[PDB]
Each structure stands twice: as C-alpha cells, then as structure tokens.
C-alpha cells in the first residue's frame, strides 16, 4: 500500500498544503512569503512536507491504461532521488517493468477524492484481477525462485534426519524450529534437509489434525511432530496461523493456489500482508539461491550431431524424392517442415534429459519463475525453423 515519491515531486504537488502548514507554524510571515519559501526550497519546508503528506493518498498510472488496475492508489513516502519507487507485486497489474518506463502521479484534492483513493483504488484492496478473479499482486519471478529454493527437499543434505540403526538414535530431531535455526547457523543443518521438528505454533494438515487432535481440537499452544524441511517451516510461518501446514516445494502454481484459497476464505487485508511477507522472504532467499548464468551452465546436448545427421538423411531422401519427380514442391516443403519440426523437438528432448534438474537455466523455467522451455531449446540445442517474409 506504499510508494516512493521523489522529494521535489511531493513538494511541488502539495505546494499549497505546505504553504498552509508553513503559515500555520511561523516559518513564513504571510502567504506570499510561504510561497517564496517553498519555491526557494528553504530547509523549513521538508519537515512540514512530511506532515502534510501524512495519510494523503496519490494515484499512480502507467500507460497504456488497459484495465482499471492501470490506475492505482498508494500512500506516498519521501524518497531520496528523482525517481518513483514502485512496489514489485503491483507490476503485473501495470504491465510495468523497470527497463525505463515512467509513470504519472495525480493528487486527489477533495475529500471525496481522497476517500475514493483510500477505499476504491487502494493497492492493497486490488489484489485480484477484475477480469479473471485470479491474484495478480503475487510473487512473479525472483520471489518465486526464492521460495522455490527455500521449500525444496534435498535428499542427503546436511543435518538430515537419519534414524540410526547403531547405538546412535536418529539425529534429525529438533525440539522447536528455533533449535533448527541454531543448528543451521552452524554448518549442521541445511534449510532444505528432510528433518523432523516439533512445531508448536503452526496448524498441521487436516489429516494429522484429525488424528492427533479433535477435528478442530487444535489451539495455538498444541504442539505436534512434523516431518519437513526447515525451509518449509519458515515458509508456512509466513502464511497466517490458521492456514494448515502445506509441505510442498512452492512452485508458482502452488503459490497461486494458496493465494486463491486465502482470497476466497480470508479478508483481503490479511491476504495483502501475506503476499508482502512472501515477497520479503522470496527476495532474501532468491539472493541466497545461487542462480547464475555462465557459458558452462548452458550445456549443449551431446547427441545433437547424430540427431541432426539422421534428420538430414531423411531430408536428403525427401530432396531426392523431389528430384525424382515424385513429390510436389509444396509437398516437398511440407515434408521438410515435418522432418525439421521433429528434429527440433528431439534435440529439445535430449537437452532436457542431459540437463541436471538443479541447473539454474532449468530451475528458473521449471519453478514457474520466468520463461518457457522453447527458449532453453533455442539457446542450447537449436532454434529450428524460422518464418518467411510472407509468413
């Protein structure tokens, strides 16, 4: 529900408000002097400015305005610089990316205008797509990957619970989540290691709740044993108490499912705060996720040569068929198109096989963070057929 306005912008927009509060206080003798002062940027104004802007909404718009979410209300806070700071979750609604686009700011003056901005057009109140009901103000790329890494289960990770057959008991039991945090501070527990912890402040799945409690016999104090990763614990902590523990690697689709559920069952303010917490966590763990690009991470399929040779043999057969006078020119083109589409799909398949599933270029696509596998296939492998000037 916030946005960052350059100081100079806010000073110019609220100029009359700041002049009024400069005459209220005795910084300015008369109103003409208040104007002259605000124009010279005398240091007295800045303090006063932050007072006038208190809880005074402003509208942000990006063109083209395709649907109403193209104009959204925000509470403004002063920012250092000459640029508008925009919350990332709203980007989807505006189709706004930071490759240089700009946005416009409008200041509602009348009381009814400010009220319409606070109630009708407040960013927090517009989490959902007015066209589809799906959620838009939702983790999009980095956030997604972040969470997708934080909620992955890595077989054999550090500190993994191992029920030991020797005299040593199993070593992956942690009294509370905080004990797991401590263990991970030392190189003893990976956030993605399949462990077992006693959770005291998170609801369990419906089934475990039915067994270990009454159908609703769960209260905040009631603890219980969970078999998850520390990451999935830290994730389910971001969702509200009442939500049952999920324990899945948070693909974008599953995050969408959770946000849909929350929007359907919960107030909207809670949903907005949940998406904001997800944002923060996803950014942190995305930084910590180790996704990079590198000439070595772009593995080329090792079977590419033989695949291409085989489909070239087929193509030479078709071309000799044409020279024989047995194929139609359009039929020759049609046969070559089928051959090469198949060869492209085959090299894409070999690529997807050869690539380890933790390869960053694969992680970014599969998690739903950004991009499709056709791009992965044209980058390594082969671009395939390209269109004609005609089409």
């Amino acid at each position: 529900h916030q946005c960052g306005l350059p100081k100079l912008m806010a000073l110019e927009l609220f100029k009359p408000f700041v002049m009024k509060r400069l005459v209220d206080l005795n910084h300015a003798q008369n109103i003409k002097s208040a104007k002259r002062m605000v124009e010279r940027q005398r240091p007295q104004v800045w303090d006063v400015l932050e007072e006038v802007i208190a809880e005074h909404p402003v509208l942000l718009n990006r063109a083209p305005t395709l649907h109403r979410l193209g104009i959204q209300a925000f509470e403004p806070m002063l920012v250092e610089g000459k640029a508008i700071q925009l919350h990332p979750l709203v980007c989807e609604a505006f189709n706004a990316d930071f490759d240089g686009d700009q946005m416009a700011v409008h200041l509602p003056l009348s009381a009814e205008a400010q009220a319409e901005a606070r109630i009708l057009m407040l960013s927090s109140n517009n989490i959902l797509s007015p066209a589809s009901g799906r959620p838009l103000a939702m983790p999009r790329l980095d956030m997604v990957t972040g969470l997708y890494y934080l909620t992955t289960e890595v077989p054999g990770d550090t500190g993994e619970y191992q029920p030991a057959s020797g005299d040593h008991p199993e070593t992956g039991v942690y009294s509370s989540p905080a004990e797991a945090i401590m263990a991970a501070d030392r190189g003893v527990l990976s956030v993605r290691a399949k462990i077992k912890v006693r959770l005291t402040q998170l609801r369990p799945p419906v089934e475990i709740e039915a067994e270990l409690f009454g159908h609703s016999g769960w209260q905040p104090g009631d603890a219980w044993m969970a078999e998850t990763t520390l990451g999935r614990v830290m994730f389910n902590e971001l969702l509200p108490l009442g939500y049952p523990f999920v324990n899945k690697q948070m693909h974008k689709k599953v995050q969408a499912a959770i946000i849909n559920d929350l929007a359907e069952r919960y107030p909207m303010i809670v949903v907005a705060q949940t998406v904001d917490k997800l944002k923060d966590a996803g950014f942190y763990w995305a930084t910590r996720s180790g996704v990079t690009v590198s000439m070595a991470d772009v593995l080329v399929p090792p079977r590419k040569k033989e695949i291409l040779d085989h489909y070239e043999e087929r193509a030479d057969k078709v071309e000799k068929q044409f020279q024989r006078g047995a194929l139609n020119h359009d039929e020759r083109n049609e046969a070559l198109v089928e051959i090469w589409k198949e060869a492209t799909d085959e090299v894409g398949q070999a690529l997807r096989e050869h690539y380890p599933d933790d390869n960053p270029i694969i992680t970014i696509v599969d998690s739903g963070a950004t991009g499709n596998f056709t791009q992965t296939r044209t980058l390594a492998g082969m671009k395939g057929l390209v269109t004609n000037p005609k089409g």
Binding site: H1, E55, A111, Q114, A115, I269, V270
Partner: protein, 73 residues
C-alpha cells in the same frame, strides 16, 4: 488475527465495510464526516481522540470504525 496495520490500511477495510452495505456508501459517509469536522475546526466532533495532526478524513474513518456515527442512504 492480523498484524497492526500501518497508516492507510488502518482501520482494516473489511471491518470498515461491515459497517456499510457497499464501498461507495462508506466513501460518501467518510467524506461527509470529514467535511463536517473541518467545518468544526473553522458542525460537530471530533468524536474520538484526534491524532497528533490526523487528517480529518482519517478521524472520520476511525469514527466510522467505532460506530460513533449513523447514516441513511
């Protein structure tokens, strides 16, 4: 069941809208109350402890949250 909201998001929108049938009714409600307050400062209210320099509209919204006001469509 929710953390203490910040500024605009306070009071929560769901609890405010429970006091009215629709969003637009609440809009006009609060705008009328805020104009009334600002007239008072130059006419009734405020009806709750006014903030340090709380915007009249914010005071009106708070009054709406405490049911200190009645209306008729």
């Amino acid at each position: 069941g929710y953390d203490t909201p910040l500024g605009i998001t306070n009071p929560p929108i769901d609890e405010l809208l429970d006091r009215v049938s629709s969003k637009y009714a609440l809009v006009i409600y609060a705008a009328k109350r805020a104009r009334q307050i600002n007239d008072y400062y130059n006419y009734v209210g405020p009806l709750v402890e006014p903030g340090l320099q709380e915007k009249p509209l914010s005071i009106a919204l708070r009054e709406i949250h405490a049911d200190l006001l009645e209306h008729t469509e």
